[PDB]
């Protein structure tokens, strides 16, 4: 009993596009069927609701925006994004509902953004230190989504702290990769963050010193 | 010249299940229509196709009462061109209807302190009704490839569930009583008049 969510991506502002879900376990067509999306970091907004009699009923945040359509030998709920804006990046979910009995099966989902945002690079600086020390790597001014921060290659996991990216006035995400160690050992070890940035094809190996 | 025995739909001690609707089958009499609506005892008295005071001097062939027992909220629903479980699932109106309708709270008559689950609706159906379809079908429904073979459990679900009504629910989740008055046409002789 699945559902398998498909077709998230990057949209331009006003562009549009359409979301799949996938399903086996329960018949689309005979079950009442959710549309529920999550911005990053907030809660669950309810987005489109479907009958198995074909009635559909729509949030005003996306009313005439956003089409709910389904598909029954294909056993796929679908949802169709015109106009999109920036308020509408978030996680997508289909789900059953069963009313009363609530929604007892839901999908991961797929991953909406919406930016007029190009690609960039994420450029990373070092944050240089001066009982216990603490030196960092600061990944600044990427997009889209995401960035992988390891430290030594690996090696050194103790100790690190990858903070969640924050989205800058530009469009442009950033984020800080730290690590504390004893203060003696600035001398011996060399230290190097690991940074890579699949969608730029971008990876670098920078020296904290 | 016998006068229309519309006391006997409207003061009816116990009312019907909205999935299973009644239909009195009005005529061969006169009705003062007007005595209805002035009665003022109606939270929703809305016609359509047809003005109500006006609805004196007119004649139909047959008038079907039809009434049954719902929420408040979902007295919207009993209109022309409605979505909405009971709109889609247990009474239909045509987008050309040319009736009306009427309802009133029946909080008092219609809800018990432990719990009155005597009036029902249809929450699963694989399609919606057609116009003045009534569905007494108790057949457990199916919502997976897996066929159910009248066992409830997981994708087979019985149809139909209970209106909760207390007499501390919220005014929408109270019990509306609703008398749907359907006319008809000539062509054919009339016996309903004013
Ligand atoms: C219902 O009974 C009351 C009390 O006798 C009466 O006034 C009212 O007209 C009756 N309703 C109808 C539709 O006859």
């Known amino acids: 009993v699945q559902l398998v969510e498909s077709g998230g991506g990057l949209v331009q502002p006003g562009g549009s596009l359409r979301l799949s879900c996938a399903a086996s376990?329960?018949?689309?067509?005979?079950?009442?069927m959710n549309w529920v999306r999550q911005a990053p970091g907030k809660g669950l907004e309810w987005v489109s609701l479907?009958?198995?009699?074909?009635?559909?009923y729509y949030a005003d945040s996306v009313k005439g925006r956003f089409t709910i359509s389904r598909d029954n030998s294909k056993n796929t709920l679908y949802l169709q994004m015109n106009s999109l804006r920036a308020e509408d990046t978030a996680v997508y979910h289909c789900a059953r509902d069963l009313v009363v009995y609530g929604m007892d099966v839901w999908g991961q989902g797929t991953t909406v953004t919406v930016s007029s945002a190009s690609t960039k690079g994420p450029s990373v600086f070092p944050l240089a230190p001066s009982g216990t020390a603490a030196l960092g790597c600061l990944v600044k001014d990427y997009f889209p989504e995401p960035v992988t921060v390891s430290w030594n290659s690996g090696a050194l996991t103790s100790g690190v702290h990858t903070f969640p990216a924050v989205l800058q006035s530009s469009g442009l995400y950033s984020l800080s990769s730290v690590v504390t160690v004893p203060s003696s050992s600035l001398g011996t070890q060399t230290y190097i963050c690991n940074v890579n940035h699949k969608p730029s094809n971008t990876k670098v190996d920078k020296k904290v010193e | 010249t016998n006068l229309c025995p519309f006391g006997e739909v409207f003061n009816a001690t116990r009312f019907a299940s909205v999935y299973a609707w009644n239909r009195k089958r009005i005529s061969n009499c006169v009705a003062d229509y007007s005595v209805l609506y002035n009665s003022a005892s109606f939270s929703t008295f809305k016609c359509y196709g047809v003005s109500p005071t006006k609805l004196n001097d007119l004649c139909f062939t047959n008038v079907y009462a039809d009434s049954f027992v719902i929420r408040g909220d979902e007295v919207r629903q009993i209109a022309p061109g409605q979505t909405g479980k009971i709109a889609d699932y247990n009474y239909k109106l045509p987008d050309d209807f040319t009736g009306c309708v009427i309802a009133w709270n029946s909080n008092n008559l219609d809800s018990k302190v432990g719990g009155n689950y005597n009036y029902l609706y249809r929450l699963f159906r694989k399609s919606n009704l057609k116009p003045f379809e009534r569905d007494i079908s108790t057949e457990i429904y199916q919502a997976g490839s897996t066929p159910c073979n009248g066992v409830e459990g997981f994708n087979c679900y019985f149809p139909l569930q209970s209106y909760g009504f207390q007499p501390t629910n919220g005014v929408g989740y109270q019990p509306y009583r609703v008398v749907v008055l359907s006319f008809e046409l000539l062509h054919a002789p009339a016996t309903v008049c004013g």
């Open positions: 479907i009958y198995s009699g074909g009635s559909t």
């Open positions: 376990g329960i018949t689309v067509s005979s079950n009442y």
